[PDB]
Amino acid sequence: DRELAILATAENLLEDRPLADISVDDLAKGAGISRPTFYFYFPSKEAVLLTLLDRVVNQADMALQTLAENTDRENMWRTGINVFFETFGSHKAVTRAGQAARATSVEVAELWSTFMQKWIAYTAAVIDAERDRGAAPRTLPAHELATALNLMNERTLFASFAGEQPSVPEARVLDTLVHIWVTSIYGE
Template sequence: MTPARTAPRDANPRGRRAARSAGDERESAILATAERLLAERSFAEISIDDLARGAGISRPTFYFYFPSKDAVLLTLLDRVTEEADAAAGDVLDRLAEDPRARWRELIGRFHETFGAHRAVVLACAQVRGTNAEVRRLWATVLERWVQAITTAVEAERRRGAAPAGLPARDLAIALNSMNERVWYATFAGDGPAVADADVVDVLLDVWLASIYRDTTAPPAAGTGQIVSPGDRYR
């Protein structure tokens, strides 16, 4: 769920012209308007005129910044995932300190970031089936997170903290996909859904049970409590 172990992101997020300054106030106004409107109505109901008006610019000026409203949504998605990646930081590199605490920290940071931008998350999920660009961008992001979790699970197995089992990549795909669906249901109120306050703990227990076959997770490295994976799960 974090790209800390993978290659750097592209310098320019998708859908934006490379020549502009990242701090351009008009671009920021367009993006802020889009996120505000997404909290009020569906993406299909938002027009370019709505975005231009909300940003205090003309329709022709809008096109200087974005070629389409789809490009606005792509940029919002890119920024949200970038924010989530930054929030995750190096958590996966510190799993041995306290596996349960670190996994909870990781899931919690993602939940907080996606929750703060739930209108964007929901809009992208809703249009993904018909919008190839959103689908491609999300697939790229999800692949990055899957690779990171795969690496983390394999590392936990190598150090004896997690038992051998299903291919780590398959496990990572299933866990990330589960998170995606659970968050969507919670944010959309699309029942049955886990209560927002309980999401992190529910997801954490499923992750721990899947990776360690035990919701308590192993002790922190260096505690002197040496138990083989085979003994722990009998």
């Protein structure tokens, strides 16, 4: 509860500054607590980002699970990719911080890797279902095609939300990715 306040403070601060320019004293102060009381909840600011990413990742995973318990094929994929556009799009600071943190934090890398393996495995299953039903041609190995498409979405989403040059404009991202997914899944 003082915990949530640390979390909300970190999320707020990461909007304007990297994690490197946020001190533990910054988190404690925004949360209305002392520095030692902070250390009772988190051993470090990295530990804060980790929890924030865990929440975001689980939120996208739960929304995708919701979707999976149920339009034409283009709209089907668009709704799925939209889960990630919206969830990560709603937590750009955290998303952006956690991506950069993969390169330093072994635990951030593991968290991200676990969830990506999951989303890939789900994409691959649907793609195999589409093949099984005769909707999609048996072209590339489904799991490798799934891997490349999910890596694309990851990089494209995060570049767009960060305003990186180069990037697809946020308002064009969803159409761009959907076109690529549908053509590479259903085409030959």
